[PDB]
Amino acid sequence: MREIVHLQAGQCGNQIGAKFWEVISDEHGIDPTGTYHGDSDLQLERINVYYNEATGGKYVPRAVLVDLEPGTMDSVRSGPFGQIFRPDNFVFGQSGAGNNWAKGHYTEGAELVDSVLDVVRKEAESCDCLQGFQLTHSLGGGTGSGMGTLLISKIREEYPDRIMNTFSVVPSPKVSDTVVEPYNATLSVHQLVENTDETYCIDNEALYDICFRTLKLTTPTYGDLNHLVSATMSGVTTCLRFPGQLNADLRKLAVNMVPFPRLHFFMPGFAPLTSRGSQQYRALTVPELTQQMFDAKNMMAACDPRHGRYLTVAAVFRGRMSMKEVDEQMLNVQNKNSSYFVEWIPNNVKTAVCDIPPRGLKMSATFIGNSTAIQELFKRISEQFTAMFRRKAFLHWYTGEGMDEMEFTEAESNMNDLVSEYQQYQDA
Amino acid sequence: MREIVHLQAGQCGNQIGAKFWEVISDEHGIDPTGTYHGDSDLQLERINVYYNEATGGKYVPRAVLVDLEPGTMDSVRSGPFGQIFRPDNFVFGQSGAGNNWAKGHYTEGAELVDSVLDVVRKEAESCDCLQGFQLTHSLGGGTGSGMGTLLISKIREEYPDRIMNTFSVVPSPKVSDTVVEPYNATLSVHQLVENTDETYCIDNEALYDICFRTLKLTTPTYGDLNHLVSATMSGVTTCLRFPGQLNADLRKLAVNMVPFPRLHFFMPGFAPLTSRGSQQYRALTVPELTQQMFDAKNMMAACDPRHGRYLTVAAVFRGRMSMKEVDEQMLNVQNKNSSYFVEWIPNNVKTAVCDIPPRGLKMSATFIGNSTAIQELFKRISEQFTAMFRRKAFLHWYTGEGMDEMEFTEAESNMNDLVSEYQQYQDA
Amino acid sequence: FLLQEARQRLNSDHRGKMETLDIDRGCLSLNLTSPNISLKINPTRVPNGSTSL
Amino acid sequence: AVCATVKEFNKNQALESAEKKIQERKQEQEDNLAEISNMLRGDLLSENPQQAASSFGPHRVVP
Amino acid sequence: MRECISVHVGQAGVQIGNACWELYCLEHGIQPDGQMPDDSFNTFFSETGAGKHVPRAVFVDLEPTVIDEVRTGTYRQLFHPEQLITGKEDAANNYARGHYTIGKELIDLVLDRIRKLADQCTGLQGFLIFHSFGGGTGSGFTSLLMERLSVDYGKKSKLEFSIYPAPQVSTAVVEPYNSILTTHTTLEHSDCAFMVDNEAIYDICRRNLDIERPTYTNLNRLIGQIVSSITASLRFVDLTEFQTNLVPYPRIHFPLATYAPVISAEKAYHEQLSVAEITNACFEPANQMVKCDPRHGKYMACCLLYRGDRTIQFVDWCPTGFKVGINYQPPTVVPGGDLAKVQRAVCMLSNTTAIAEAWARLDHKFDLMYAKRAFVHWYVGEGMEEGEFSEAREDMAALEKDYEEVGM
Numbered sequence A, B: 001m002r003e004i005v006h007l008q009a010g011q012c013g014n015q016i017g018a019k020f021w022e023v024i025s026d027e028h029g030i031d032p033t034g035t036y037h038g039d040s041d042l043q044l045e046r047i048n049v050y051y052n053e054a055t056g057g058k059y060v061p062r063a064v065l066v067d068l069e070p071g072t073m074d075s076v077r078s079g080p081f082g083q084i085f086r087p088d089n090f091v092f093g094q095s096g097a098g099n100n101w102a103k104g105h106y107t108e109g110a111e112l113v114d115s116v117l118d119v120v121r122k123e124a125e126s127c128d129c130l131q132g133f134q135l136t137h138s139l140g141g142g143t144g145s146g147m148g149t150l151l152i153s154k155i156r157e158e159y160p161d162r163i164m165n166t167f168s169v170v171p172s173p174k175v176s177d178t179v180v181e182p183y184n185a186t187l188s189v190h191q192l193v194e195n196t197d198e199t200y201c202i203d204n205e206a207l208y209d210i211c212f213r214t215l216k217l218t219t220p221t222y223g224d225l226n227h228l229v230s231a232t233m234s235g236v237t238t239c240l241r242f243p244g245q246l247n248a249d250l251r252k253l254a255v256n257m258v259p260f261p262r263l264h265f266f267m268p269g270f271a272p273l274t275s276r277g278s279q280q281y282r283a284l285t286v287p288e289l290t291q292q293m294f295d296a297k298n299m300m301a302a303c304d305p306r307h308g309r310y311l312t313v314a315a316v317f318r319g320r321m322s323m324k325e326v327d328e329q330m331l332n333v334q335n336k337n338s339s340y341f342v343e344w345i346p347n348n349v350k351t352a353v354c355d356i357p358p359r360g361l362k363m364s365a366t367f368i369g370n371s372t373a374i375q376e377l378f379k380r381i382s383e384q385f386t387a388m389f390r391r392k393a394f395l396h397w398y399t400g401e402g403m404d405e406m407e408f409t410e411a412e413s414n415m416n417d418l419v420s421e422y423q424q425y426q427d428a
Numbered sequence C: 001f002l003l004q005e006a007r008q009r010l011n012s013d014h015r016g017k018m019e020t021l022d023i024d025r026g027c028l029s030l031n032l033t034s035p036n037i038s039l040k041i042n043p044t045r046v047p048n049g050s051t052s053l
Numbered sequence D: 001a002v003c004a005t006v007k008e009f010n011k012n013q014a015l016e017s018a019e020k021k022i023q024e025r026k027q028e029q030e031d032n033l034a035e036i037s038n039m040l041r042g043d044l045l046s047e048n049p050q051q052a053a054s055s056f057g058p059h060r061v062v063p
Numbered sequence E: 001m002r003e004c005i006s007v008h009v010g011q012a013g014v015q016i017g018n019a020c021w022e023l024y025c026l027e028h029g030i031q032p033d034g035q036m037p038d039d040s041f042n043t044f045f046s047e048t049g050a051g052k053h054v055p056r057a058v059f060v061d062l063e064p065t066v067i068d069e070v071r072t073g074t075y076r077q078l079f080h081p082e083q084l085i086t087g088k089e090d091a092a093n094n095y096a097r098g099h100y101t102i103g104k105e106l107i108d109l110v111l112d113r114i115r116k117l118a119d120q121c122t123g124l125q126g127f128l129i130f131h132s133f134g135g136g137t138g139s140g141f142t143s144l145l146m147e148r149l150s151v152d153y154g155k156k157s158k159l160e161f162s163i164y165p166a167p168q169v170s171t172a173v174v175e176p177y178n179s180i181l182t183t184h185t186t187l188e189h190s191d192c193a194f195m196v197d198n199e200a201i202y203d204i205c206r207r208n209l210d211i212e213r214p215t216y217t218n219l220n221r222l223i224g225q226i227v228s229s230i231t232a233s234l235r236f237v238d239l240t241e242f243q244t245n246l247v248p249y250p251r252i253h254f255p256l257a258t259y260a261p262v263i264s265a266e267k268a269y270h271e272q273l274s275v276a277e278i279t280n281a282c283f284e285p286a287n288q289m290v291k292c293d294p295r296h297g298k299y300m301a302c303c304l305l306y307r308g309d310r311t312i313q314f315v316d317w318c319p320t321g322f323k324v325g326i327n328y329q330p331p332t333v334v335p336g337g338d339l340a341k342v343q344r345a346v347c348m349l350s351n352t353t354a355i356a357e358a359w360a361r362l363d364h365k366f367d368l369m370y371a372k373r374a375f376v377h378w379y380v381g382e383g384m385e386e387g388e389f390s391e392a393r394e395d396m397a398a399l400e401k402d403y404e405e406v407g408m
Ligand SMILES: Nc1nc2c(ncn2[C@@H]2O[C@H](COP(=O)(O)OP(=O)(O)OP(=O)(O)O)[C@@H](O)[C@H]2O)c(=O)[nH]1
Pocket: A245, A246, E009, E010, E011, E012, E013, E015, E016, E062, E063, E090, E091, E092, E093, E094, E132, E134, E135, E136, E137, E138, E139, E163, E170, E171, E198, E216, E217, E219, E220
């Protein structure tokens, strides 16, 4: 009875969601038709957090799949799990955003939000007590960033006391594949600071780094980077569905890592990620989960936490483990490091223990760390936004949609001050 | 309870320390795949000194292999016992040191030093109570000695209360397979002075005298020399792994033999080394172990203690044997000789008895001695450094890497005082 | 090759079941007048290798 | 006598607690084997190309 | 006619009450179905005319997923189905949510079921409230419960068993704000609050018993043993004489707890457990249940509950400081539990001056956060004014000077 509505936009948000739902359905014993084929009773007990019961024992997800072109709605529909989605929930337009923010926010996406808000008002009335929403989108595109941050601004005026997570794929300076990347990324970080409650930052050059040096994959596709993200996406909602010795809502994680209302950009991590050659060497205990969780080779964002203080830290464990050993390793990582942790917060790490491990593992964990090393992520964008805009490199696409030049000036000082806001706790 | 984190550096450092692990694993009954197949419980009760636990009853060593070229990190993996190591602990660069001490200290080995202090801290902060590290390296190469002193210079500062033992292979007096040897060894012995608790001195020429004259082999090899080093490495650290009638840790030998903090260069040896043919005549008693520790032909350094004085002497006995008959022989050699012992220490010998013998032997013995005849080693390195450095021979291969000429001039005068330090404990 | 490996394991399982059938039949065959009743060293103890039902 | 039977009960309880500890350690090793066997059989680490097969037909693939 | 209504608020309360009620079922003949296969159960159980025995407890939470396990567990048939009260959304480590916004949806239901339970009992001693300082519901709804129980149930005894926050380990960031804002509003509304923290019980389960890596159940069982030793003289002293003999001044109601033999069955064979041994082991600082030390303070009162068969320095004004009670039933072993079977035990409840360092550390950490105004927007936006931080801090300043003043 704490339901979660999934919202997913763009090609990036529809190919993450095709793999996230492929992970949850294994976790609850749902085949690609929709019938429960499982071997427990805990799986059927709280399936209503994500699944809507149909007639005949079928379960369909509570997801809305939006896009501005019809090309990515067919590869989703032709995957292994593409026949569980309710066919009305696909909302797709017939002219793309074209890597343009303004068409996504003013011209094409503005004629589509009123045909999406009808859909999400249908899955917000099937819930006896709705917990909150979720968006997966890419900040480097045109319909993940224009329409996606247009939906959040229209959701948050209609359900203003709920929880609105995002899973942002922030652009990387090295792995980049669009010339006009920093215009959309600057004008969307301005749109996330005053309309989300939590925002996990993901860079694609940090998921390639994990798939090259830890899992040692030969050719990681996007299907192996969507599996890395989707293991954290179900690691933060895992006490809403399975019991434990010390639970954690999504609201309880909002309380403990947001000390001030504009500081909610995190960096996720997932603990037992290992190769296939190093599988018989690994010893499978709780101190090995804690050593890898805090590793700076392991964060899903491309910024190093050795360059700043840790404001607050989370940990969401799974499995059957000991509450002494869980609680003595958070104290242990906190007393050696005197100046990696902020001084006016005496205890920084919040722990929770669920009791049911992922399908095929003994135990697992998850990390949601709030750092003042996240403000270097917004300065590589702000050194490339101002290199182009000082000569007006590409503006005639953007101006000719009803958009003014002054929005490129108010979205400079509104991100130049968040860097200074994270800076004032970097040093007292 | 008393852990040792093994380090090893270079082609010399890995071909020594891959045979040492085959020695230890058959001292504890570990098969080539890693599992335990033994017929005692003294083989297993103190195995946590060296072996991390893995899953399924499998034990992996606490060793970190550093190198600067990937060719000698595949002969190690393809040996007999090469599959027991965790594959992450293999560290290798892509471009060699090139027998250049500057290239491994300043240029190539200053970016690899940051990538191995992640490995050595994951293995140091996973111990219940860390006793102290090790090193195995050579002062003639580039990655054993350039980077290999950069490690000790760095992890003395982070861990200044623990033990830092080293097993140097300092350059040989007669045989010399590198022209640019004396710039390597002169610039490295200054870094050994300040940052090291104990240092042994092993000459590869004096390993060749044993394996021909005494052991009487037709063909010696660099496995019959790496068996002699590893049979001394095991003797110093066997009262940590096996019970005795009198114990001796790694501290209790450094407490007794190092009076003044600049004087920690020792002279190993090993007593029962006998041939096939002469075995019928040899191998008799305990007076035939004190006869052959102290024989001046058996020293593992090519410097003779008849030239000077034993500051302090040590002996670690292995085998279940008489606490009287051990103590009567050390009284016997301390009293017959007068000018081989310093005047201001009247009990120069420390003794230890370990019960469980080496593999295949019924009794054995091990030696450490500390001499003011070890300062004839540095008067022969400095006769061939300032021979070359007077007319500035190979100077561009070091100055163009980022050094200067007065880093040379201090490093000779940081050896021409330790020579004249030992010359004042020569006569009171 | 896989069928050979499976036959190996089934043969070992059959071997174990016949030998404990022998032991159980002997234990039932003992009575109040056997000459091998001998008040042994330690009953009610469980050996080191002991699985459950 | 009452002290004798309390001490006998304590000794017996020590035997059952030790056997329970041995049993749970062996069950932990069994779960470790299931861990590593399922993770090696998993398609993410096996990289079998059959995951690119599509429900539309055997000629098209999933991008 | 000697009943005790138990109230279990929070996940800590429910998971402790599971172990307590298993022990209470097993001490008498009660099966987990509810049938016996004598009337001494009447202090804890009610006898329906259909043969069934129903406990006198109320389980409260704002989250359903820790009471649903009680509803689907082994003890499913024992509990009355509406003695277990659940909300929909929890308090989320927020004293304001647990006091003002969410707890007001459940306070009337809890008071209704408490009134229905208290009408059965002829002679009711008092209530027992099990809660944790750190959580949301156990810090907000518990304080709201005592505030709305003081005006409704007279001068009845209101005993509290609390999980006080441990000196160096905790499972939350926002814990000191809760741990001060609940003490400020339960200072005048309580009679006796025995405080045990999880860190000292971890130390005892590691040291006395040989359980390295324990979980919460090995702690809940020892808490259940202490509650049974407190209430055992009703079944086989009272609850009423505790508040007279432990609380001199009406703001210093914070005693401590100890159980004397907590030993394993492989070391109960090696030793005597005579009355002198267990009495000496009560007063040892390694065996206390709060990580503190009464050598560095002054004793004020002691109550010694025996069950079965110049270092200690007192204050100037209390020379005697001893209440002694004796019961005859030895403690009962549960299967699967870790303590031995013993003939004698002692539980000591001691009021001491050496708890001043706990309030000094709590005030230090509250100051460390609140001087830079961290986490305040959550507490302000949920129907709670900002100035309550200032009043709670100056009130606990008065409490520290009280602990110094009585000692001087
Ligand atoms: N001794 C003991 N302590 C427990 C147990 N369960 C939870 N705790 C304590 O509970 C504290 C965490 O707060 P909780 O009580 O779990 O949370 P809550 O009171 O339900 O508040 P909300 O989560 O907001 O609903 C931890 O500090 C633990 O010390 C238990 O079974 N035994």
